């Protein structure tokens, strides 16, 4: 049930603390009680070095349902990003984050985030979540890359 999820999230936290990619950040939020909330994490993914995303730090929220880890968590960029697989709400469209597609209860938080970071540089064309970005990526790649570099600069650290 809910307890099963909470225990597994405590484990994910311990593993993330000891082993996680340079530049990434994944942290649980605190309840109004001041208590720690494992169902809602505040993360930030850095753009892959060597790509137009390089330099940017993109914040996203990870939300867990009480059936975790049976059902994958919902990931959402705050604010929404210019990107083919990212819905305007901010939700990320990724096959491993779909319970009926690839999500395996075994997938870790390090894997999810790395999977999202990869998806940034490489849009999956099998599923459109944003009409314009997804169109510009297929129709005119030069404009796509131009905007993405602007976005990367927009989310540069200060």
């Amino acid at each position: 049930m809910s307890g099963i999820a909470l225990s597994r999230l405590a484990q994910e936290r311990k593993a993330w603390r000891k082993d996680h990619p340079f530049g990434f950040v994944a942290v649980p939020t605190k309840n109004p009680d001041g208590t720690m909330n494992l169902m809602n994490w505040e993360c930030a993914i850095p753009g892959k070095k060597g790509t137009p995303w390089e330099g940017g730090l993109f914040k996203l929220r990870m939300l867990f349902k009480d059936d975790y880890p049976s059902s994958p968590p919902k990931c959402k960029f705050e604010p929404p990003l210019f990107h083919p697989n990212v819905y305007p709400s901010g939700t990320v469209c990724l096959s491993i984050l779909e319970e009926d597609k690839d999500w395996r209860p075994a997938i870790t938080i390090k894997q999810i985030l790395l999977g999202i970071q990869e998806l940034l540089n490489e849009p999956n064309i099998q599923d459109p979540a944003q009409a314009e970005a997804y169109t510009i990526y297929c129709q005119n790649r030069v404009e796509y890359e131009k905007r993405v570099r602007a976005q990367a600069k927009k989310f540069a650290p200060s």
């Binding site: 000891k18 996680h20 064309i125 459109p128 314009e132 169109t135």
Partner: protein, 910 residues
């Protein structure tokens, strides 16, 4: 429609380039039908043609993967080899073509390979490898062979297969790994292999690493990966390969290999030191992850092998190097945070050992932990005031979370070092004070703060010494100011047992109370000390009350902290003689009763409301903590204030915010006074009835329920409450009729009140002014509300209501007259209209009807189940008769009734 290359290709164009979402979604859904169609086995190969652009080509490749992965039964066994061949050809074709189509065709081939084993394809790896060594240049064929070998494992991981089927595939797959690794080793040891091939090789290695292949088979590749850490281009991949290889669940099965890895880890020390020297954070971060991965995950296993203790100890020091890496976290480095969990593990492992292992290992690591303490306090130290300014909001937050993590680490280091850690702190602080950046002093105190609550009270003679040093610190910064206050608060419980030291810490707290920039920390600490030492703080009560009154008068604290301070005083006064409580209560309230009065005679304003509310809040917060029982100064104060209270109600009887602040003052009073509150009952009921009429609120019902419970036994004082009970019900019932589902909270409280009445004052239902039929109607409808709280409360009412059958005439008539209605609602809930979470609740209503209304229950159930499809369409006539026979048993333990409902509610739902 009809799936042809022409039509499928037109749809791809629409999805890819038609800007309009509607269309795209159409094209997507049409393509989803086309990808699974039988025509895919025909048009997918056509979409691979050179004229189709890459993206369009991908759909063809992807559709091929779907048909093999999804419709394997569409292929005959004689066509396996031919199909096999067609895909190898296509992969060779695209080794020089588009990269996306290559991968996609590789996944397709891997799906077919897996479907084939173990028997249909004896040596999937051998065949693949042999064919690529054989049109294309070496690099293109090699990268393609690796792409295929890399995706193979990844497809297995997603292959949804049967325990039986999957085992056979996994088994053959572990055998196939015997051909994969050799190849990978070759490519790395060949100086002719290009950087791009090296990267794919590491990536390939990590893929099979997820399959949990024995750590020993990896020695050759793990050693090569370590060596690749030298090459900047390969760093990322090998760090990930090494960490994953060492982090495998069963990697602990091969302890020997692990020992052999330690030296490979220590060999990185030079590279690590250099990265620190150059400031390259990405690198130290990676090497640290590798070191932490080995030592953190196999600490006890490596400690078990005592003969190698020296090797492990070097590893521990390397980690110590990363924990203390030069610079500030996380601006200058982000590595130290990776090592904190490690120090917990190491310590835990040593305490686990017994006898010689524990004692000898303790002699080895006790000095290592003292060194750590020194390192942790330097890292918990703040950067210079100037440098800190340049930190972003985020960087500051990461350092706050980082300090919290160090506090937990220090709390464990305490359990490893014992009281000698405390003495160590005393010497460091003492030395700094007499032998001077606030940062350095603040960190040392922070050390004490993180350990303060965990300290046993047994080895606390050193603690007094430390308390003494606090009053000698130069509080030059707000950060140091809070730490000092928090430390004092942390020692709150310790002070309650050692009252002499109060004298030393209190002056500091009372002085901080006058500085608004230190409002939150000072008031919380005062509250803690006031809660813990009230019995030893009676002598100082006079000074505390004075400094609190002054501070309030100067608007030094924000409303929320004004309330904390009042709670603090509640505690403090609860410990003084009644005569003293009275002298101070007036000192505290007199100066506000005046402001309230100016305010009561004032014409209502937005600013007028905030002020009136804040003052009432002070009172209710004061009376929450002021329980003299566990004269009546509070009673007198109440009677005196009541006169003013009423004045306020006249102009604000219609304010939601105000009508409740007043309610709160009586709620907290009644909880503190309880029975002694008896004088006020009469006045309070009159005031509550008017309050409730004007503006109904759950809070009022809750206080009414508190009253009924408290004065249910003494008939002397109860008459006024009876009046209030009836009034409140009349009003609630009528408000319920307008929009029953608009006030879940009021309905909830109303149900609780009603149940409380049934439990403690049953006769109340005999009142002629009471509408028993309407109440029963309200409770039955409430059971169907969305909110669990509201339903539980309704169930609770019926639980109490039924046992009163035959005891009170009115309750007997209603259950006989409208009880069928209740039962039907209960079966609707069990049938599925209620959360499964509430089943136990509804079962209670059934048990109650079985025990008290059996003759009626027996009759009602038979009528209510006669209709087919109710309570559920899934229920068979036989099933219904099985349940009714089980429920109509005259003897049953309530524990069994819940079971019957559980079993039944599952059938109704599936």
């Amino acid at each position: 429609l009809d799936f042809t290359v022409e039509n499928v290709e037109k749809a791809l164009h629409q999805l890819y380039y038609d800007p309009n979402i509607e269309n795209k979604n159409l094209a997507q859904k049409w393509l989803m039908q086309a990808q699974v169609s039988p025509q895919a086995w025909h048009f997918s190969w056509q979409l691979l043609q050179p004229d189709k652009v890459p993206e369009i080509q991908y759909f063809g490749a992807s559709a091929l993967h779907i048909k093999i992965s999804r419709y394997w039964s569409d292929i005959p066994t004689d066509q396996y080899e031919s199909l096999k061949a067609q895909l190898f050809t296509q992969i060779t074709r695209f080794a020089s073509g588009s990269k996306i189509v290559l991968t996609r065709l590789c996944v397709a081939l891997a799906s077919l390979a897996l479907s084939m084993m173990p028997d249909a394809w004896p040596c999937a790896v051998a065949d693949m490898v042999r064919l690529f060594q054989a049109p294309v240049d070496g690099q293109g064929r090699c990268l393609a062979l690796l792409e295929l070998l890399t995706v193979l494992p990844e497809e297995f991981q997603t292959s949804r297969l049967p325990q039986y089927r999957k085992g056979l595939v996994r088994t053959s797959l572990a055998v196939e790994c015997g051909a994969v690794f050799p190849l990978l080793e070759q490519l790395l040891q060949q100086p002719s292999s290009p950087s791009c091939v090296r990267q794919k090789v590491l990536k390939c290695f990590s893929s099979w690493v997820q399959l949990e292949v024995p750590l020993q088979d990896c020695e050759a590749l793990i050693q090569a990966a370590f060596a690749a850490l030298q090459d900047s281009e390969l760093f990322d991949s090998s760090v990930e390969a090494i960490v994953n290889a060492i982090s495998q669940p069963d990697a602990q099965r091969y302890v020997n290999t692990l020992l052999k890895l330690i030296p490979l880890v220590l060999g990185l020390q030079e590279q690590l030191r250099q990265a620190v020297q150059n400031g390259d954070m990405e690198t130290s971060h990676g090497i640290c992850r590798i070191a932490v991965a080995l030592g953190e995950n196999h600490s006890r296993a490596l400690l078990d092998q005592v003969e190698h203790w020296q090797s492990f100890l070097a590893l521990v020091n390397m980690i110590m190097f990363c924990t203390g890496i030069p610079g500030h976290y996380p601006v200058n480095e982000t590595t130290s945070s990776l090592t904190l969990t490690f120090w917990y593990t190491l310590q835990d492992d040593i305490l686990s050992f017994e006898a010689e292992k524990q004692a000898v290992y303790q002699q080895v690591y006790r000095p290592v932990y003292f060194q750590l303490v020194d390192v942790l306090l330097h890292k918990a130290q703040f950067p210079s005031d100037e440098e800190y300014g340049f930190w972003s909001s985020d960087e500051k937050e990461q350092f706050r979370i980082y300090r919290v993590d160090i506090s937990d680490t220090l709390m464990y280091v305490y359990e490893m070092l014992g009281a000698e850690l405390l003495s160590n702190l005393y010497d460091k602080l003492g030395r700094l004070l007499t032998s001077y950046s606030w940062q350095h002093t603040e960190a040392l105190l922070y050390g004490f703060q993180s350990i303060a609550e965990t300290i046993d009270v047994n080895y606390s003679d050193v603690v007094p010494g430390l308390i003494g040093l606090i009053p000698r610190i130069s509080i030059s910064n707000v950060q140091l100011a809070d730490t000092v206050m928090f430390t004092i608060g942390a020692l709150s419980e310790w002070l309650a047992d050692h009252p002499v030291m109060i004298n030393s810490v209190l002056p500091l707290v009372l002085h901080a109370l006058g500085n608004p920039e230190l409002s939150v920390s000072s008031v919380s600490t005062l509250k803690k000390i006031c809660r813990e030492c009230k019995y030893d703080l009676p002598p100082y009560a006079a000074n505390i009350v004075a400094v609190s009154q002054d501070v309030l008068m100067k608007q030094i604290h924000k409303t929320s902290q004004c309330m904390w301070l009042m709670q603090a005083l509640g505690f403090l006064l609860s410990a003084l003689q009644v005569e003293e409580i009275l002298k101070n209560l007036h000192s505290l309230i007199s100066p506000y009763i005046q402001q309230l009065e100016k305010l009561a005679e004032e014409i209502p304003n937005p600013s007028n409301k905030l002020a009136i509310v804040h003052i009432l809040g002070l009172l209710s917060n004061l009376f929450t903590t002021l329980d003299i029982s566990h004269p009546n100064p509070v009673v007198v104060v109440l009677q005196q204030v009541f006169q003013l209270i009423q004045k306020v109600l006249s102009k604000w009887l219609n304010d939601a915010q105000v009508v409740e602040a007043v309610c709160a003052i009586f709620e907290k009073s009644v909880k503190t006074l309880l029975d002694d509150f008896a004088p006020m009952v009469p006045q309070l009921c009159e005031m509550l009835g008017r309050m409730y009429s004007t503006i109904p609120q759950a809070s009022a019902l809750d206080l009414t329920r508190q009253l009924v419970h408290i004065f249910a036994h003494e008939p002397a004082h109860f008459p006024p409450i009876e009046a209030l009970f009836l009034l409140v019900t009349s009003v609630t019932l009528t408000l319920f009729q307008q929009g029953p589902r608009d006030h879940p909270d009021i309905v909830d409280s109303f149900m609780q009140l009603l149940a409380q009445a049934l439990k403690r004052k049953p006769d109340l239902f005999l009142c002629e002014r009471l509408d028993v039929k309407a109440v029963f109607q309200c409770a039955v409808l409430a059971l169907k509300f969305p909110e669990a709280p509201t339903v539980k409360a309704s169930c609770g009412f019926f639980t109490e209501l039924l046992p009163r059958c035959g005891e009170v005439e009115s309750v007997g008539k209603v259950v006989q007259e409208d009880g069928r209605m209740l039962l039907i609602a209960v079966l609707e809930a069990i049938g599925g209209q209620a959360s499964r979470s509430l089943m136990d609740c509804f079962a209670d209503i059934l048990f109650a009807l079985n025990k008290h209304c059996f003759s009626l229950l027996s009759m009602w159930i038979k009528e209510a189940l006669q209709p087919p499809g109710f309570p559920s369409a899934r229920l068979s006539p036989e099933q219904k008769d099985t349940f009714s026979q089980q429920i109509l048993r005259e003897r049953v333990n309530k524990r069994r009734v819940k079971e019957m409902v559980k079993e039944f509610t599952l059938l109704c739902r599936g």
